Steps between C-alpha positions, in 0.01 A plus 500: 500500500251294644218533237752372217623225755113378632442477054824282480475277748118422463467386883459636843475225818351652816579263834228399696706327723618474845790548731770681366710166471256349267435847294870484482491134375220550291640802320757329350348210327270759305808643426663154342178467332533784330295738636779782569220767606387454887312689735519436908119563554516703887289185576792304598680618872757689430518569114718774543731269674441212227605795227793567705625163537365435090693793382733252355323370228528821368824463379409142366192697319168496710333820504313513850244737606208532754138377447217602719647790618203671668645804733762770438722332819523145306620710190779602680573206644510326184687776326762518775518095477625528148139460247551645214177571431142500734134375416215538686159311447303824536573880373660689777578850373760536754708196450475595136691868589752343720585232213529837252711704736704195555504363178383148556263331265128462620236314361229589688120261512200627305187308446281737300522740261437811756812353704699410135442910385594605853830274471590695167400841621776424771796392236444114490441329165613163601201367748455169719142381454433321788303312503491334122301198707200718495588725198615258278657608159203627367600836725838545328296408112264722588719756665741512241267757264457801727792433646794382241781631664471327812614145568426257765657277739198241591601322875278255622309248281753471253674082453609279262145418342474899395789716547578505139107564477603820712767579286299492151336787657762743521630481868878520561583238792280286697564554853411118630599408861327160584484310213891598540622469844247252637702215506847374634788653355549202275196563337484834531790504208326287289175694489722774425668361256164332315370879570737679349500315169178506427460899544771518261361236235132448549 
């Protein structure tokens, strides 16, 4: 479900935020903007609570899940708070067999081609390349010969000057979180908005 829904909605917004009240406040005007795939980053306090208390965007059609997820104990709190599906920034081999065994979709990190082959010996052929900052996408271009059959979610890096640029490469969502959530929440919605439109024109 998730693959097909990540290649139809073209976006992913990670929080770098703060306090649970403005995560809260801030995950809503990505939502208005368009931008109806989120991810409470365990960065915030409390992003299990801030799921919890989210869950109702679900309903309104936000699809929220957990970014830098590092240990097995912050994967269950974040699939006990309601994510639907976990990322990490790094390959963790465990987190990757609780999210099989528990069915929850998990995108884990890989850098370099000895982490990407790893990542598809283990089942995963949807990958987070963090970071494109230092990659760039001249990794996924490059990437894309030995490896067709996997595709690439580049977070970190990616804005408005070149996300399109990202996307001409073959990648399936950007996963930007402070060119879209550094703001107030008035703002917030319009980058969203002006972000949103250009991935799907360009």
């Amino acid at each position: 479900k998730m693959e097909e829904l990540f290649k139809k909605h073209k976006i992913v917004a990670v929080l770098r935020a703060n306090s649970v009240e403005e995560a809260k406040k801030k995950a809503l005007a990505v939502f208005l903007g368009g931008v109806h795939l989120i991810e409470i980053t365990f960065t915030v306090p409390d992003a299990d609570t801030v799921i919890k208390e989210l869950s109702f965007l679900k309903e309104m059609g936000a699809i929220i899940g957990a970014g830098t997820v590092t240990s097995v104990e912050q994967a269950r709190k974040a699939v006990e708070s309601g994510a639907e599906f976990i990322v990490s920034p790094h390959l963790d081999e465990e987190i990757s067999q609780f999210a099989k065994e528990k069915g929850v979709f998990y995108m884990p990190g890989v850098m370099t081609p000895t982490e990407l082959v790893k990542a598809m010996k283990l089942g995963h052929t949807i990958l987070k390349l963090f970071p494109g900052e230092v990659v760039g996408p001249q990794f996924v271009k490059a990437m894309k010969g030995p490896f067709p059959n996997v595709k690439f979610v580049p977070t970190g890096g990616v804005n408005l000057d070149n996300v399109c640029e990202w996307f001409k490469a073959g990648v399936l969502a950007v996963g930007v979180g402070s060119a879209l959530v550094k703001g107030t929440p008035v703002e917030v919605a319009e980058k969203a908005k002006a972000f949103v439109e250009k991935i799907r024109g360009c």
